[PDB]
RNA sequence: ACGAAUCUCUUUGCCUUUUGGCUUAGAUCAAGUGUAGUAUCUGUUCUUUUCAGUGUAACAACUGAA
RNA sequence: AAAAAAAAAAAAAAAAAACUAGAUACUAACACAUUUAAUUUUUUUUUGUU
């Protein structure tokens, strides 16, 4: 699809879901010229770009490359994206996908620089929780939740899974952040000790904000 | 200038591939 | 008194002497202590340069890397070689001690690893690639990813390098950069010479491919450079569209 | 019991003896590791 | 009355210094002798006529012949090279290469 | 040990807005103290404390404990 | 052993194939892999007995320049590395010692990496298919971008 | 071992028993030999268990073991964790040669 | 001795330079 | 040709701290080791006859007889 | 501050290899004093008496 005029969202047979942006070097040019020029005629291309054509006739044929913008792995095969301008009067425009095995999900842009930080911190908290509990147990046996995968119930690291075919870029997993609601208060206040920042109550506020206000 | 996305799973995948028969919880 | 004491032949000594620089650097301050350490990289004897290189890694973790790093990036300019390895070795240690952080500090060190992988003598190209192994694993998934193509473009020509300590350090780097880039964007460099006529060029690429295939078996499957004509059988179910 | 003199430690004597003269042998062995004054002289 | 002995000490700091420190001192002086005191300049310093004029020091510490593009570990090695038959040739080749143009 | 690398009265008696006696006093989630007229007027412009610049959310308690410690008799 | 003229006819990009590709055990496959959409050629310094990095360019490489944002932190002046103490005066320093050598400011150092230099990113870096060949020098290429824009 | 080339690992299917490290080799990853940031316990095969052999450090296999052995975080990211039994079999060139010279 | 007095003389000259440029800067402000 | 001025050059001549003193040289004191591995100078030999095999990306190199 | 011009020779796309010995820098948190309380060098023609 197109989220935008310079960018694109996609899927794979294998489950990846990615967003590709076209570079600004190409945006200045495509903005300052009339399309008839591209095929033949004079576009003034920087010294470098041509030398990539001659040095690599196969790769740089076009001659620019998208910069991968997001990548993330959801084990379904995404059939349709639907870019919505809003969901239920929400401000943040979402793009809601739907998969083969049956699914719906959404990618919501986070417009803050402030939120993406917090949510980031919460994904990092819950991501290795099964490791943290385990280190506290080991060191509390040394001097005075038994399995290493206790909190994840299976061995998998998160980033290793959600990465899979290729590493995640900017997509922060909001379905992991949402297990934080399901823990007992003892465990929540245990995990949250890692943040100099706000208390459990404010985490839960933040996590819950997305369904209420953003969709 | 980037794009930061947040993922949710609204409705979970429904192809049920495995089953088991017992008594798990009382 | 400690900085003289790590000449000792024992290890547990050398190891505890370095740990107590963190306890002092936390106490008094990092910059008073660094200048003590950096003056000691000029020294010839290897234990002393490695055991200082550890301590600068330890002072970085405990007092924060932003305090240490520009003093180390400056010391790298000195024309003596033993300093320039000791400043690259110290940076390896300090990026495995601050595990996750490391993302904040990239972009600054790409130019410092620029001169290292470009440099003539074979040991710099060994220690900077030993920085990349630590810097790639734990900064993967961040979204830098364009610093690791830069850092990759400089490594691959070292694939032909011999020496045993040099070549395993470079393979470790190439194995680690695979996780910053992904097997696909990384494999583009490796398909070409995977056959090749040269028996040598061929021999060197196969090592790298073997390391990749172990970490990724089902993760390479989308990326193989195989077409219906290029092989007899292919698989007809990869072209199917519903 | 070797105390064998490489062509470097021969070349450093003739430069040391030129500098320090022949009666300062204690100083010549300062420029020259592995070797004492009685060995240098 | 221990003045009878005849040894003493100055009241400043802590004397002997550390074996590693002696090597640094000794390997500078040895490279001063064999060098016959000349200052061999760094490669980046933007040129005190040199005794010869080809030998330098790279951005690292090593010595290099800029004709022959050889790298040297020590002054002792260099004097081997300057007295060698390869560093002889490259002077003759530059000899001819100049004698064919001005 | 201070690291650069990394009967106190905290109650002003006159306002920070009125610069006058506290009347119909107000408490925030801080130890901030204002008049009922004070705090309502600051939110007409400012999002946060007139002092901390922390988030007040317009949240204001009746501060009677102030009038207490502003009594000569306390409570 | 197909002549390269025979081998260049198979390929959608005949300009990559070279005289030696003819001798590969499986050239038909090699020519098709090499000409695949995004494969990047093997670095060219094989067949060179030189050891990849050899002098002639490396003789004149400049020592190091700190990135400008870091150079703002003033360390360049406090420790002069380019290009002293009697051994007695050094051993007196171990016993005394002297404090506050650098006089660096902690708040300034932190901000360079975080607040001010948050988004500072290196000027050129490299692109997907740029391998570093031995004689290339990036210090020219970086300036040539800087040159074209300002003039 | 990372720096000593002659020593041969086991690389068989790990059982349920935990490897042990002597006081001297304590705190080390058996793969990269680093002292930092452990993650997972090691697990060694049965045929490295049995009698006296089971107790000895899984690195030097000489001294007796006490603490558990963990894989460091970086060795669990790459996957070198699960290759196999991370136990050194031979005593190696370095250890022998010191031994005979001393006597 | 040679080195020590050299370096000390360098220090003294630096101090002079410092005071001079002080006086110039204060002059630039009229004082 | 010659009286003769000025710049340039060689030589003779002139020359710089050409070592601060003194005594019983004023006295006395000094280098760790082992396992694995690479880098870098110099010395010595070959650009020199054909073909057949081994070998190499191609050389080279190696192997036979006129 | 500041105020032009005009009289129809050259150009260059920027020493090895082998042999044999010697010389010096350097690389691996390489190893350098603990090692020993469950467990396989302990080997002989079987031969310890209420
Ligand atoms: Mg006295
Ligand atoms: Zn030369
Ligand atoms: Zn008021
Ligand atoms: Zn407040
Ligand atoms: Zn052990
Ligand atoms: Zn490890
Ligand atoms: Zn085993």
mmCIF file with all atom_site columns, N, CA and C in Angstrom, chain A residues 15-74:
data_model
loop_
_atom_site.group_PDB
_atom_site.id
_atom_site.type_symbol
_atom_site.label_atom_id
_atom_site.label_alt_id
_atom_site.label_comp_id
_atom_site.label_asym_id
_atom_site.label_entity_id
_atom_site.label_seq_id
_atom_site.pdbx_PDB_ins_code
_atom_site.Cartn_x
_atom_site.Cartn_y
_atom_site.Cartn_z
_atom_site.occupancy
_atom_site.B_iso_or_equiv
_atom_site.pdbx_formal_charge
_atom_site.auth_seq_id
_atom_site.auth_comp_id
_atom_site.auth_asym_id
_atom_site.auth_atom_id
_atom_site.pdbx_PDB_model_num
ATOM 1   N N  . UNK A 1 15 ? 5.420  -13.836 6.639   1.00 0.00 ? 15 UNK A N  1
ATOM 2   C CA . UNK A 1 15 ? 4.853  -13.297 7.864   1.00 0.00 ? 15 UNK A CA 1
ATOM 3   C C  . UNK A 1 15 ? 5.409  -11.959 8.234   1.00 0.00 ? 15 UNK A C  1
ATOM 4   N N  . UNK A 1 16 ? 6.503  -11.568 7.652   1.00 0.00 ? 16 UNK A N  1
ATOM 5   C CA . UNK A 1 16 ? 7.017  -10.261 7.948   1.00 0.00 ? 16 UNK A CA 1
ATOM 6   C C  . UNK A 1 16 ? 6.030  -9.195  7.533   1.00 0.00 ? 16 UNK A C  1
ATOM 7   N N  . UNK A 1 17 ? 6.100  -8.053  8.209   1.00 0.00 ? 17 UNK A N  1
ATOM 8   C CA . UNK A 1 17 ? 5.346  -6.851  7.817   1.00 0.00 ? 17 UNK A CA 1
ATOM 9   C C  . UNK A 1 17 ? 6.260  -5.678  7.948   1.00 0.00 ? 17 UNK A C  1
ATOM 10  N N  . UNK A 1 18 ? 6.457  -4.951  6.847   1.00 0.00 ? 18 UNK A N  1
ATOM 11  C CA . UNK A 1 18 ? 7.504  -3.945  6.738   1.00 0.00 ? 18 UNK A CA 1
ATOM 12  C C  . UNK A 1 18 ? 7.072  -2.676  6.076   1.00 0.00 ? 18 UNK A C  1
ATOM 13  N N  . UNK A 1 19 ? 7.784  -1.598  6.336   1.00 0.00 ? 19 UNK A N  1
ATOM 14  C CA . UNK A 1 19 ? 7.490  -0.325  5.756   1.00 0.00 ? 19 UNK A CA 1
ATOM 15  C C  . UNK A 1 19 ? 8.735  0.192   5.133   1.00 0.00 ? 19 UNK A C  1
ATOM 16  N N  . UNK A 1 20 ? 8.622  0.672   3.910   1.00 0.00 ? 20 UNK A N  1
ATOM 17  C CA . UNK A 1 20 ? 9.724  1.146   3.097   1.00 0.00 ? 20 UNK A CA 1
ATOM 18  C C  . UNK A 1 20 ? 9.569  2.571   2.764   1.00 0.00 ? 20 UNK A C  1
ATOM 19  N N  . UNK A 1 21 ? 10.573 3.370   3.052   1.00 0.00 ? 21 UNK A N  1
ATOM 20  C CA . UNK A 1 21 ? 10.545 4.780   2.645   1.00 0.00 ? 21 UNK A CA 1
ATOM 21  C C  . UNK A 1 21 ? 11.557 5.051   1.591   1.00 0.00 ? 21 UNK A C  1
ATOM 22  N N  . UNK A 1 22 ? 11.189 5.943   0.669   1.00 0.00 ? 22 UNK A N  1
ATOM 23  C CA . UNK A 1 22 ? 12.042 6.391   -0.404  1.00 0.00 ? 22 UNK A CA 1
ATOM 24  C C  . UNK A 1 22 ? 12.908 7.572   0.059   1.00 0.00 ? 22 UNK A C  1
ATOM 25  N N  . UNK A 1 23 ? 14.185 7.582   -0.328  1.00 0.00 ? 23 UNK A N  1
ATOM 26  C CA . UNK A 1 23 ? 15.137 8.439   0.372   1.00 0.00 ? 23 UNK A CA 1
ATOM 27  C C  . UNK A 1 23 ? 14.925 9.893   0.020   1.00 0.00 ? 23 UNK A C  1
ATOM 28  N N  . UNK A 1 24 ? 15.383 10.816  0.872   1.00 0.00 ? 24 UNK A N  1
ATOM 29  C CA . UNK A 1 24 ? 15.183 12.240  0.537   1.00 0.00 ? 24 UNK A CA 1
ATOM 30  C C  . UNK A 1 24 ? 15.968 12.730  -0.681  1.00 0.00 ? 24 UNK A C  1
ATOM 31  N N  . UNK A 1 25 ? 17.143 12.168  -0.940  1.00 0.00 ? 25 UNK A N  1
ATOM 32  C CA . UNK A 1 25 ? 17.881 12.487  -2.161  1.00 0.00 ? 25 UNK A CA 1
ATOM 33  C C  . UNK A 1 25 ? 16.977 12.365  -3.379  1.00 0.00 ? 25 UNK A C  1
ATOM 34  N N  . UNK A 1 26 ? 16.151 11.332  -3.398  1.00 0.00 ? 26 UNK A N  1
ATOM 35  C CA . UNK A 1 26 ? 15.188 11.139  -4.465  1.00 0.00 ? 26 UNK A CA 1
ATOM 36  C C  . UNK A 1 26 ? 13.953 12.027  -4.314  1.00 0.00 ? 26 UNK A C  1
ATOM 37  N N  . UNK A 1 27 ? 13.687 12.533  -3.123  1.00 0.00 ? 27 UNK A N  1
ATOM 38  C CA . UNK A 1 27 ? 12.518 13.359  -2.951  1.00 0.00 ? 27 UNK A CA 1
ATOM 39  C C  . UNK A 1 27 ? 12.762 14.759  -3.441  1.00 0.00 ? 27 UNK A C  1
ATOM 40  N N  . UNK A 1 28 ? 13.949 15.312  -3.190  1.00 0.00 ? 28 UNK A N  1
ATOM 41  C CA . UNK A 1 28 ? 14.281 16.621  -3.753  1.00 0.00 ? 28 UNK A CA 1
ATOM 42  C C  . UNK A 1 28 ? 14.159 16.547  -5.263  1.00 0.00 ? 28 UNK A C  1
ATOM 43  N N  . UNK A 1 29 ? 14.781 15.533  -5.846  1.00 0.00 ? 29 UNK A N  1
ATOM 44  C CA . UNK A 1 29 ? 14.799 15.426  -7.297  1.00 0.00 ? 29 UNK A CA 1
ATOM 45  C C  . UNK A 1 29 ? 13.388 15.259  -7.859  1.00 0.00 ? 29 UNK A C  1
ATOM 46  N N  . UNK A 1 30 ? 12.661 14.273  -7.375  1.00 0.00 ? 30 UNK A N  1
ATOM 47  C CA . UNK A 1 30 ? 11.305 14.084  -7.874  1.00 0.00 ? 30 UNK A CA 1
ATOM 48  C C  . UNK A 1 30 ? 10.401 15.282  -7.602  1.00 0.00 ? 30 UNK A C  1
ATOM 49  N N  . UNK A 1 31 ? 10.742 16.133  -6.648  1.00 0.00 ? 31 UNK A N  1
ATOM 50  C CA . UNK A 1 31 ? 9.962  17.318  -6.398  1.00 0.00 ? 31 UNK A CA 1
ATOM 51  C C  . UNK A 1 31 ? 10.328 18.443  -7.358  1.00 0.00 ? 31 UNK A C  1
ATOM 52  N N  . UNK A 1 32 ? 11.595 18.523  -7.756  1.00 0.00 ? 32 UNK A N  1
ATOM 53  C CA . UNK A 1 32 ? 12.071 19.642  -8.567  1.00 0.00 ? 32 UNK A CA 1
ATOM 54  C C  . UNK A 1 32 ? 12.061 19.391  -10.061 1.00 0.00 ? 32 UNK A C  1
ATOM 55  N N  . UNK A 1 33 ? 11.464 18.297  -10.507 1.00 0.00 ? 33 UNK A N  1
ATOM 56  C CA . UNK A 1 33 ? 11.472 17.991  -11.927 1.00 0.00 ? 33 UNK A CA 1
ATOM 57  C C  . UNK A 1 33 ? 10.137 17.452  -12.399 1.00 0.00 ? 33 UNK A C  1
ATOM 58  N N  . UNK A 1 34 ? 9.979  17.450  -13.723 1.00 0.00 ? 34 UNK A N  1
ATOM 59  C CA . UNK A 1 34 ? 8.792  16.950  -14.409 1.00 0.00 ? 34 UNK A CA 1
ATOM 60  C C  . UNK A 1 34 ? 9.102  15.569  -14.958 1.00 0.00 ? 34 UNK A C  1
ATOM 61  N N  . UNK A 1 35 ? 8.199  14.601  -14.743 1.00 0.00 ? 35 UNK A N  1
ATOM 62  C CA . UNK A 1 35 ? 8.558  13.187  -14.916 1.00 0.00 ? 35 UNK A CA 1
ATOM 63  C C  . UNK A 1 35 ? 9.165  12.821  -16.256 1.00 0.00 ? 35 UNK A C  1
ATOM 64  N N  . UNK A 1 36 ? 8.785  13.513  -17.321 1.00 0.00 ? 36 UNK A N  1
ATOM 65  C CA . UNK A 1 36 ? 9.292  13.183  -18.649 1.00 0.00 ? 36 UNK A CA 1
ATOM 66  C C  . UNK A 1 36 ? 10.807 13.167  -18.703 1.00 0.00 ? 36 UNK A C  1
ATOM 67  N N  . UNK A 1 37 ? 11.441 13.885  -17.782 1.00 0.00 ? 37 UNK A N  1
ATOM 68  C CA . UNK A 1 37 ? 12.886 13.995  -17.756 1.00 0.00 ? 37 UNK A CA 1
ATOM 69  C C  . UNK A 1 37 ? 13.583 12.701  -17.352 1.00 0.00 ? 37 UNK A C  1
ATOM 70  N N  . UNK A 1 38 ? 12.929 11.857  -16.574 1.00 0.00 ? 38 UNK A N  1
ATOM 71  C CA . UNK A 1 38 ? 13.645 10.735  -15.979 1.00 0.00 ? 38 UNK A CA 1
ATOM 72  C C  . UNK A 1 38 ? 14.108 9.731   -17.010 1.00 0.00 ? 38 UNK A C  1
ATOM 73  N N  . UNK A 1 39 ? 13.263 9.422   -17.988 1.00 0.00 ? 39 UNK A N  1
ATOM 74  C CA . UNK A 1 39 ? 13.578 8.345   -18.935 1.00 0.00 ? 39 UNK A CA 1
ATOM 75  C C  . UNK A 1 39 ? 14.786 8.715   -19.768 1.00 0.00 ? 39 UNK A C  1
ATOM 76  N N  . UNK A 1 40 ? 14.671 9.838   -20.459 1.00 0.00 ? 40 UNK A N  1
ATOM 77  C CA . UNK A 1 40 ? 15.786 10.396  -21.183 1.00 0.00 ? 40 UNK A CA 1
ATOM 78  C C  . UNK A 1 40 ? 15.744 11.884  -20.982 1.00 0.00 ? 40 UNK A C  1
ATOM 79  N N  . UNK A 1 41 ? 16.895 12.487  -21.180 1.00 0.00 ? 41 UNK A N  1
ATOM 80  C CA . UNK A 1 41 ? 17.027 13.879  -20.930 1.00 0.00 ? 41 UNK A CA 1
ATOM 81  C C  . UNK A 1 41 ? 17.843 14.088  -19.688 1.00 0.00 ? 41 UNK A C  1
ATOM 82  N N  . UNK A 1 42 ? 17.899 15.349  -19.315 1.00 0.00 ? 42 UNK A N  1
ATOM 83  C CA . UNK A 1 42 ? 18.846 15.783  -18.348 1.00 0.00 ? 42 UNK A CA 1
ATOM 84  C C  . UNK A 1 42 ? 18.205 15.854  -16.985 1.00 0.00 ? 42 UNK A C  1
ATOM 85  N N  . UNK A 1 43 ? 18.634 14.923  -16.144 1.00 0.00 ? 43 UNK A N  1
ATOM 86  C CA . UNK A 1 43 ? 18.572 15.064  -14.716 1.00 0.00 ? 43 UNK A CA 1
ATOM 87  C C  . UNK A 1 43 ? 20.022 15.050  -14.289 1.00 0.00 ? 43 UNK A C  1
ATOM 88  N N  . UNK A 1 44 ? 20.354 15.975  -13.408 1.00 0.00 ? 44 UNK A N  1
ATOM 89  C CA . UNK A 1 44 ? 21.694 16.067  -12.916 1.00 0.00 ? 44 UNK A CA 1
ATOM 90  C C  . UNK A 1 44 ? 21.791 15.272  -11.629 1.00 0.00 ? 44 UNK A C  1
ATOM 91  N N  . UNK A 1 45 ? 22.529 14.175  -11.767 1.00 0.00 ? 45 UNK A N  1
ATOM 92  C CA . UNK A 1 45 ? 22.726 13.190  -10.745 1.00 0.00 ? 45 UNK A CA 1
ATOM 93  C C  . UNK A 1 45 ? 24.088 13.380  -10.128 1.00 0.00 ? 45 UNK A C  1
ATOM 94  N N  . UNK A 1 46 ? 24.174 13.281  -8.806  1.00 0.00 ? 46 UNK A N  1
ATOM 95  C CA . UNK A 1 46 ? 25.455 13.520  -8.158  1.00 0.00 ? 46 UNK A CA 1
ATOM 96  C C  . UNK A 1 46 ? 26.500 12.552  -8.674  1.00 0.00 ? 46 UNK A C  1
ATOM 97  N N  . UNK A 1 47 ? 27.761 12.934  -8.560  1.00 0.00 ? 47 UNK A N  1
ATOM 98  C CA . UNK A 1 47 ? 28.876 12.125  -9.049  1.00 0.00 ? 47 UNK A CA 1
ATOM 99  C C  . UNK A 1 47 ? 28.800 10.690  -8.583  1.00 0.00 ? 47 UNK A C  1
ATOM 100 N N  . UNK A 1 48 ? 28.412 10.503  -7.329  1.00 0.00 ? 48 UNK A N  1
ATOM 101 C CA . UNK A 1 48 ? 28.510 9.215   -6.657  1.00 0.00 ? 48 UNK A CA 1
ATOM 102 C C  . UNK A 1 48 ? 27.575 8.218   -7.352  1.00 0.00 ? 48 UNK A C  1
ATOM 103 N N  . UNK A 1 49 ? 26.318 8.637   -7.462  1.00 0.00 ? 49 UNK A N  1
ATOM 104 C CA . UNK A 1 49 ? 25.229 7.749   -7.833  1.00 0.00 ? 49 UNK A CA 1
ATOM 105 C C  . UNK A 1 49 ? 25.527 7.080   -9.166  1.00 0.00 ? 49 UNK A C  1
ATOM 106 N N  . UNK A 1 50 ? 26.079 7.832   -10.114 1.00 0.00 ? 50 UNK A N  1
ATOM 107 C CA . UNK A 1 50 ? 26.409 7.243   -11.397 1.00 0.00 ? 50 UNK A CA 1
ATOM 108 C C  . UNK A 1 50 ? 27.462 6.155   -11.192 1.00 0.00 ? 50 UNK A C  1
ATOM 109 N N  . UNK A 1 51 ? 28.492 6.479   -10.442 1.00 0.00 ? 51 UNK A N  1
ATOM 110 C CA . UNK A 1 51 ? 29.574 5.523   -10.208 1.00 0.00 ? 51 UNK A CA 1
ATOM 111 C C  . UNK A 1 51 ? 29.077 4.234   -9.556  1.00 0.00 ? 51 UNK A C  1
ATOM 112 N N  . UNK A 1 52 ? 27.970 4.296   -8.821  1.00 0.00 ? 52 UNK A N  1
ATOM 113 C CA . UNK A 1 52 ? 27.344 3.077   -8.365  1.00 0.00 ? 52 UNK A CA 1
ATOM 114 C C  . UNK A 1 52 ? 26.676 2.329   -9.505  1.00 0.00 ? 52 UNK A C  1
ATOM 115 N N  . UNK A 1 53 ? 26.032 3.028   -10.439 1.00 0.00 ? 53 UNK A N  1
ATOM 116 C CA . UNK A 1 53 ? 25.513 2.323   -11.593 1.00 0.00 ? 53 UNK A CA 1
ATOM 117 C C  . UNK A 1 53 ? 26.627 1.569   -12.331 1.00 0.00 ? 53 UNK A C  1
ATOM 118 N N  . UNK A 1 54 ? 27.701 2.259   -12.716 1.00 0.00 ? 54 UNK A N  1
ATOM 119 C CA . UNK A 1 54 ? 28.750 1.564   -13.441 1.00 0.00 ? 54 UNK A CA 1
ATOM 120 C C  . UNK A 1 54 ? 29.390 0.480   -12.601 1.00 0.00 ? 54 UNK A C  1
ATOM 121 N N  . UNK A 1 55 ? 29.498 0.687   -11.296 1.00 0.00 ? 55 UNK A N  1
ATOM 122 C CA . UNK A 1 55 ? 30.186 -0.313  -10.510 1.00 0.00 ? 55 UNK A CA 1
ATOM 123 C C  . UNK A 1 55 ? 29.305 -1.511  -10.220 1.00 0.00 ? 55 UNK A C  1
ATOM 124 N N  . UNK A 1 56 ? 27.991 -1.290  -10.225 1.00 0.00 ? 56 UNK A N  1
ATOM 125 C CA . UNK A 1 56 ? 27.013 -2.335  -9.900  1.00 0.00 ? 56 UNK A CA 1
ATOM 126 C C  . UNK A 1 56 ? 25.830 -2.223  -10.831 1.00 0.00 ? 56 UNK A C  1
ATOM 127 N N  . UNK A 1 57 ? 25.959 -2.748  -12.035 1.00 0.00 ? 57 UNK A N  1
ATOM 128 C CA . UNK A 1 57 ? 24.863 -2.619  -12.939 1.00 0.00 ? 57 UNK A CA 1
ATOM 129 C C  . UNK A 1 57 ? 23.614 -3.357  -12.498 1.00 0.00 ? 57 UNK A C  1
ATOM 130 N N  . UNK A 1 58 ? 23.749 -4.444  -11.733 1.00 0.00 ? 58 UNK A N  1
ATOM 131 C CA . UNK A 1 58 ? 22.553 -5.163  -11.372 1.00 0.00 ? 58 UNK A CA 1
ATOM 132 C C  . UNK A 1 58 ? 21.806 -4.557  -10.196 1.00 0.00 ? 58 UNK A C  1
ATOM 133 N N  . UNK A 1 59 ? 22.543 -4.164  -9.181  1.00 0.00 ? 59 UNK A N  1
ATOM 134 C CA . UNK A 1 59 ? 21.917 -3.754  -7.957  1.00 0.00 ? 59 UNK A CA 1
ATOM 135 C C  . UNK A 1 59 ? 21.268 -2.399  -8.095  1.00 0.00 ? 59 UNK A C  1
ATOM 136 N N  . UNK A 1 60 ? 22.034 -1.400  -8.531  1.00 0.00 ? 60 UNK A N  1
ATOM 137 C CA . UNK A 1 60 ? 21.593 -0.026  -8.480  1.00 0.00 ? 60 UNK A CA 1
ATOM 138 C C  . UNK A 1 60 ? 20.995 0.474   -9.773  1.00 0.00 ? 60 UNK A C  1
ATOM 139 N N  . UNK A 1 61 ? 20.497 -0.433  -10.584 1.00 0.00 ? 61 UNK A N  1
ATOM 140 C CA . UNK A 1 61 ? 19.895 -0.072  -11.826 1.00 0.00 ? 61 UNK A CA 1
ATOM 141 C C  . UNK A 1 61 ? 18.983 1.159   -11.798 1.00 0.00 ? 61 UNK A C  1
ATOM 142 N N  . UNK A 1 62 ? 18.230 1.402   -10.723 1.00 0.00 ? 62 UNK A N  1
ATOM 143 C CA . UNK A 1 62 ? 17.034 2.285   -10.877 1.00 0.00 ? 62 UNK A CA 1
ATOM 144 C C  . UNK A 1 62 ? 17.245 3.784   -11.061 1.00 0.00 ? 62 UNK A C  1
ATOM 145 N N  . UNK A 1 63 ? 17.693 4.425   -9.970  1.00 0.00 ? 63 UNK A N  1
ATOM 146 C CA . UNK A 1 63 ? 18.939 4.162   -9.248  1.00 0.00 ? 63 UNK A CA 1
ATOM 147 C C  . UNK A 1 63 ? 18.807 4.968   -7.939  1.00 0.00 ? 63 UNK A C  1
ATOM 148 N N  . UNK A 1 64 ? 18.323 4.290   -6.924  1.00 0.00 ? 64 UNK A N  1
ATOM 149 C CA . UNK A 1 64 ? 18.112 4.750   -5.549  1.00 0.00 ? 64 UNK A CA 1
ATOM 150 C C  . UNK A 1 64 ? 17.580 3.482   -4.873  1.00 0.00 ? 64 UNK A C  1
ATOM 151 N N  . UNK A 1 65 ? 17.549 3.478   -3.566  1.00 0.00 ? 65 UNK A N  1
ATOM 152 C CA . UNK A 1 65 ? 16.992 2.335   -2.913  1.00 0.00 ? 65 UNK A CA 1
ATOM 153 C C  . UNK A 1 65 ? 16.162 2.839   -1.729  1.00 0.00 ? 65 UNK A C  1
ATOM 154 N N  . UNK A 1 66 ? 15.058 2.168   -1.461  1.00 0.00 ? 66 UNK A N  1
ATOM 155 C CA . UNK A 1 66 ? 14.326 2.482   -0.312  1.00 0.00 ? 66 UNK A CA 1
ATOM 156 C C  . UNK A 1 66 ? 15.272 2.322   0.879   1.00 0.00 ? 66 UNK A C  1
ATOM 157 N N  . UNK A 1 67 ? 15.066 3.122   1.914   1.00 0.00 ? 67 UNK A N  1
ATOM 158 C CA . UNK A 1 67 ? 15.607 2.797   3.224   1.00 0.00 ? 67 UNK A CA 1
ATOM 159 C C  . UNK A 1 67 ? 14.526 2.064   3.944   1.00 0.00 ? 67 UNK A C  1
ATOM 160 N N  . UNK A 1 68 ? 14.803 0.850   4.385   1.00 0.00 ? 68 UNK A N  1
ATOM 161 C CA . UNK A 1 68 ? 13.865 0.139   5.240   1.00 0.00 ? 68 UNK A CA 1
ATOM 162 C C  . UNK A 1 68 ? 13.513 0.998   6.469   1.00 0.00 ? 68 UNK A C  1
ATOM 163 N N  . UNK A 1 69 ? 12.247 1.068   6.758   1.00 0.00 ? 69 UNK A N  1
ATOM 164 C CA . UNK A 1 69 ? 11.759 2.008   7.712   1.00 0.00 ? 69 UNK A CA 1
ATOM 165 C C  . UNK A 1 69 ? 11.208 1.342   8.919   1.00 0.00 ? 69 UNK A C  1
ATOM 166 N N  . UNK A 1 70 ? 10.312 0.372   8.782   1.00 0.00 ? 70 UNK A N  1
ATOM 167 C CA . UNK A 1 70 ? 10.020 -0.587  9.859   1.00 0.00 ? 70 UNK A CA 1
ATOM 168 C C  . UNK A 1 70 ? 10.093 -1.990  9.364   1.00 0.00 ? 70 UNK A C  1
ATOM 169 N N  . UNK A 1 71 ? 10.260 -2.947  10.255  1.00 0.00 ? 71 UNK A N  1
ATOM 170 C CA . UNK A 1 71 ? 10.156 -4.370  9.908   1.00 0.00 ? 71 UNK A CA 1
ATOM 171 C C  . UNK A 1 71 ? 9.761  -5.042  11.155  1.00 0.00 ? 71 UNK A C  1
ATOM 172 N N  . UNK A 1 72 ? 8.915  -6.018  11.053  1.00 0.00 ? 72 UNK A N  1
ATOM 173 C CA . UNK A 1 72 ? 8.400  -6.680  12.265  1.00 0.00 ? 72 UNK A CA 1
ATOM 174 C C  . UNK A 1 72 ? 7.818  -8.007  11.827  1.00 0.00 ? 72 UNK A C  1
ATOM 175 N N  . UNK A 1 73 ? 7.668  -8.930  12.751  1.00 0.00 ? 73 UNK A N  1
ATOM 176 C CA . UNK A 1 73 ? 7.301  -10.279 12.315  1.00 0.00 ? 73 UNK A CA 1
ATOM 177 C C  . UNK A 1 73 ? 6.121  -10.791 13.048  1.00 0.00 ? 73 UNK A C  1
ATOM 178 N N  . UNK A 1 74 ? 5.060  -11.051 12.296  1.00 0.00 ? 74 UNK A N  1
ATOM 179 C CA . UNK A 1 74 ? 3.852  -11.583 12.819  1.00 0.00 ? 74 UNK A CA 1
ATOM 180 C C  . UNK A 1 74 ? 3.531  -12.866 12.086  1.00 0.00 ? 74 UNK A C  1
#
